[PDB]
Design an enzyme around this catalytic site. Structure first.
Site, PDB file in Angstrom:
ATOM      1  N   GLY A 105       7.222   4.563   3.371  1.00  0.00           N
ATOM      2  CA  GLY A 105       7.828   5.704   3.709  1.00  0.00           C
ATOM      3  C   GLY A 105       9.199   5.912   4.257  1.00  0.00           C
ATOM      4  O   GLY A 105       9.966   4.948   3.969  1.00  0.00           O
ATOM      5  N   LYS A 106       9.682   6.863   4.889  1.00  0.00           N
ATOM      6  CA  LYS A 106      11.079   6.605   5.335  1.00  0.00           C
ATOM      7  C   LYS A 106      11.284   5.814   6.481  1.00  0.00           C
ATOM      8  O   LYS A 106      12.236   5.180   6.635  1.00  0.00           O
ATOM      9  CB  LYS A 106      11.814   8.094   5.654  1.00  0.00           C
ATOM     10  N   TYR A 107      10.030   5.450   7.299  1.00  0.00           N
ATOM     11  CA  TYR A 107      10.180   4.803   8.415  1.00  0.00           C
ATOM     12  C   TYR A 107       9.449   3.217   8.416  1.00  0.00           C
ATOM     13  O   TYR A 107       9.917   2.370   9.129  1.00  0.00           O
ATOM     14  CB  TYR A 107       9.438   5.377   9.744  1.00  0.00           C
ATOM     15  N   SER A 108       8.627   3.188   7.140  1.00  0.00           N
ATOM     16  CA  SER A 108       7.935   1.552   7.286  1.00  0.00           C
ATOM     17  C   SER A 108       7.381   1.429   5.687  1.00  0.00           C
ATOM     18  O   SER A 108       7.648   2.370   5.066  1.00  0.00           O
ATOM     19  CB  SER A 108       6.878   1.478   8.197  1.00  0.00           C
ATOM     20  N   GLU A 109       7.195   0.164   5.545  1.00  0.00           N
ATOM     21  CA  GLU A 109       6.532  -0.457   4.111  1.00  0.00           C
ATOM     22  C   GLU A 109       5.084  -0.820   4.808  1.00  0.00           C
ATOM     23  O   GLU A 109       5.203  -1.440   5.900  1.00  0.00           O
ATOM     24  CB  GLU A 109       7.416  -1.594   3.642  1.00  0.00           C
ATOM     25  N   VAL A 110       4.071  -0.473   4.123  1.00  0.00           N
ATOM     26  CA  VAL A 110       2.815  -0.810   4.397  1.00  0.00           C
ATOM     27  C   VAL A 110       2.044  -1.741   3.478  1.00  0.00           C
ATOM     28  O   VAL A 110       2.332  -1.513   2.204  1.00  0.00           O
ATOM     29  CB  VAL A 110       1.981   0.418   4.844  1.00  0.00           C
ATOM     30  N   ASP A 162       1.132  13.884  14.998  1.00  0.00           N
ATOM     31  CA  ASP A 162       1.174  13.811  13.525  1.00  0.00           C
ATOM     32  C   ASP A 162      -0.180  13.806  13.049  1.00  0.00           C
ATOM     33  O   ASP A 162      -0.561  12.941  12.261  1.00  0.00           O
ATOM     34  CB  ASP A 162       2.031  12.736  13.146  1.00  0.00           C
ATOM     35  N   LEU A 189       0.700  -1.408   0.105  1.00  0.00           N
ATOM     36  CA  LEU A 189      -0.114  -0.003  -0.111  1.00  0.00           C
ATOM     37  C   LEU A 189       0.980   1.222   0.077  1.00  0.00           C
ATOM     38  O   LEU A 189       0.233   2.288  -0.374  1.00  0.00           O
ATOM     39  CB  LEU A 189      -0.978   0.003   1.175  1.00  0.00           C
ATOM     40  N   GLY A 190       2.127   1.080   0.671  1.00  0.00           N
ATOM     41  CA  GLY A 190       2.913   2.327   0.676  1.00  0.00           C
ATOM     42  C   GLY A 190       4.207   2.206   1.393  1.00  0.00           C
ATOM     43  O   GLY A 190       4.543   1.080   1.797  1.00  0.00           O
TER      44      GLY A 190
HETATM   45  N1  LIG Z   1      -5.207   0.459   9.296  1.00  0.00           N
HETATM   46  C1  LIG Z   1      -5.251   0.661   7.785  1.00  0.00           C
HETATM   47  N2  LIG Z   1      -6.324   0.311   6.985  1.00  0.00           N
HETATM   48  C2  LIG Z   1      -6.279   0.408   5.904  1.00  0.00           C
HETATM   49  N3  LIG Z   1      -5.392   1.424   5.046  1.00  0.00           N
HETATM   50  C3  LIG Z   1      -4.462   1.777   6.059  1.00  0.00           C
HETATM   51  C4  LIG Z   1      -4.292   1.531   7.411  1.00  0.00           C
HETATM   52  N4  LIG Z   1      -2.830   2.048   8.058  1.00  0.00           N
HETATM   53  C5  LIG Z   1      -2.586   2.405   6.794  1.00  0.00           C
HETATM   54  N5  LIG Z   1      -3.305   2.483   5.482  1.00  0.00           N
HETATM   55  C6  LIG Z   1      -2.798   3.009   4.026  1.00  0.00           C
HETATM   56  O1  LIG Z   1      -1.706   2.565   3.838  1.00  0.00           O
HETATM   57  C7  LIG Z   1      -0.999   3.248   2.842  1.00  0.00           C
HETATM   58  C8  LIG Z   1       0.160   3.622   2.922  1.00  0.00           C
HETATM   59  O2  LIG Z   1       0.608   4.298   4.345  1.00  0.00           O
HETATM   60  P1  LIG Z   1       1.784   5.441   4.446  1.00  0.00           P
HETATM   61  O3  LIG Z   1       1.697   5.895   5.915  1.00  0.00           O
HETATM   62  O4  LIG Z   1       3.060   4.890   4.160  1.00  0.00           O
HETATM   63  O5  LIG Z   1       1.316   6.446   3.430  1.00  0.00           O
HETATM   64  P2  LIG Z   1       0.377   7.828   3.417  1.00  0.00           P
HETATM   65  O6  LIG Z   1      -0.864   7.561   3.863  1.00  0.00           O
HETATM   66  O7  LIG Z   1       0.202   8.502   2.195  1.00  0.00           O
HETATM   67  O8  LIG Z   1       1.065   8.862   4.535  1.00  0.00           O
HETATM   68  P3  LIG Z   1       1.963  10.150   4.529  1.00  0.00           P
HETATM   69  O9  LIG Z   1       1.609  11.360   4.083  1.00  0.00           O
HETATM   70  O10 LIG Z   1       2.677  10.102   6.253  1.00  0.00           O
HETATM   71  O11 LIG Z   1       3.345   9.766   3.525  1.00  0.00           O
HETATM   72  C9  LIG Z   1      -1.995   4.560   2.584  1.00  0.00           C
HETATM   73  O12 LIG Z   1      -2.784   4.494   1.593  1.00  0.00           O
HETATM   74  C10 LIG Z   1      -2.830   4.343   4.030  1.00  0.00           C
HETATM   75  O13 LIG Z   1      -4.146   4.773   3.800  1.00  0.00           O
END
Ligand SMILES: Nc1ncnc2c1ncn2[C@@H]1O[C@H](COP(=O)(O)OP(=O)(O)OP(=O)(O)O)[C@@H](O)[C@H]1O
Length: 327
Positions: free
Chosen positions: A46-51, A154, A43-44
């Protein structure tokens, strides 16, 4: 040097607690089974994690797995402790598990999944009633974490997951959250640029829960005025100038004078002299349906330079702006 400051609410909540509650470094992590989770899609990052979106194969439920990068892997106990402390609280994301990722060899936090709509599409569809409703839901999460001795640090649209179909909200990403201890000097390199409070921008370290209330005011102003972001700084210095163009420079100088802060001299040639603008300056035919005298008064009470003057989350929930919201 600078004049000290303390929160006006929940000041001493952590000092009464057993050290177990807030001494996160002493916490022993209980590890779950990594094989319970099947990764589905990234899903994404960042500098601190992979989601990742994943499936919990024990109950066939959707989950989200945040695999921490080595840089975030250092303060994992703080995020774990905060998530465990706040678990079950109103509108707080639920930490379902902590497992060791077999590839990264780092901790992977498993969260409940929320069916979110990206704020860039969602905020354009919110009605006046929806903004009030969802702002009240965010406040429940903020008053809970503040009452538990924790500042989020944040607050921003990307950290508020909204399942609009079910009218459900969760406050996520507790990786920058911290325990509030009166008199503690904190790092000012927190929150995202457009949501950073003036205390962070002027390098005032003895801040508190009220930082989250500034960030919430920035979200409110963007929602009611349909201006994303509301304070559009090019960098952290210009971020304060953008704020000063709205709130004025006189109240900025009174704020720094009160706390005996000395502004970075780089502001001498960029800050200028600005009067406070009336909130009606930001009203136009395209956002007028989201604006009311109650919304403006509520916003005015969040967006204050002096962190001690801002509404607390509980005072915000008492505001007339929320009288129309069904409770
Ligand atoms: N509990 C969750 N359920 C569903 N989607 C989630 C959950 N936690 C995170 N996400 C999704 O995971 C994706 C990646 O998250 P990530 O924090 O790396 O990026 P981001 O949302 O664009 O934030 P940032 O602005 O801090 O870079 C995003 O689309 C976020 O909405």
């Amino acid at each position: 040097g600078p004049v000290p400051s303390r929160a006006r609410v929940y000041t001493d909540v952590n000092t009464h607690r057993p050290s177990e509650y807030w001494d996160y470094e002493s916490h022993v992590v209980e590890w779950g089974n990594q094989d319970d989770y099947q990764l589905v899609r990234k899903l994404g990052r960042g500098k601190y994690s992979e989601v990742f979106e994943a499936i919990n194969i024990t109950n066939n439920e959707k989950v989200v797995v945040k695999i921490l990068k080595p840089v975030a892997a250092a303060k994992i106990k703080r995020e774990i402790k905060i998530l465990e402390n706040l678990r079950g609280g109103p509108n707080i994301i639920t930490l379902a598990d902590i497992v060791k990722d077999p590839v990264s060899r780092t901790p992977a936090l498993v969260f409940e999944h929320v069916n979110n709509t990206d704020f860039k599409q969602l905020y354009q569809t919110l009605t006046d009633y929806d903004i009030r409703f969802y702002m009240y839901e965010i406040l429940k999460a903020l008053d809970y974490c503040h009452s538990m001795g924790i500042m989020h640090r944040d607050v921003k649209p990307h950290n508020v997951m909204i399942d609009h179909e079910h009218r459900k909200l969760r406050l996520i990403d507790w990786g920058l959250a911290e325990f509030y201890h009166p008199g503690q000097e904190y790092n000012v390199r927190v929150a995202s640029r457009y949501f950073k409070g003036p205390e962070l921008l002027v390098d005032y370290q003895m801040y508190d829960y009220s930082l989250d209330m500034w960030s919430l005011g920035c979200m409110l102003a963007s929602m009611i005025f349909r201006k994303e972001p509301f304070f559009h700084g090019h960098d952290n210095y210009d971020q304060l100038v953008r704020i000063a163009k709205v709130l004025g420079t006189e109240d900025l100088y009174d704020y720094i004078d009160k706390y005996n802060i000395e502004l970075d001299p780089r502001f001498n040639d960029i800050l200028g002299r600005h009067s406070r603008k009336r909130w009606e300056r930001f009203v136009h035919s395209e956002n007028q349906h989201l604006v009311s005298p109650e919304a403006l008064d509520f916003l005015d009470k969040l967006l204050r330079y002096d962190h001690q003057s801002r509404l607390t989350a509980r005072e915000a929930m008492e505001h007339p702006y929320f009288y129309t919201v069904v409770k």
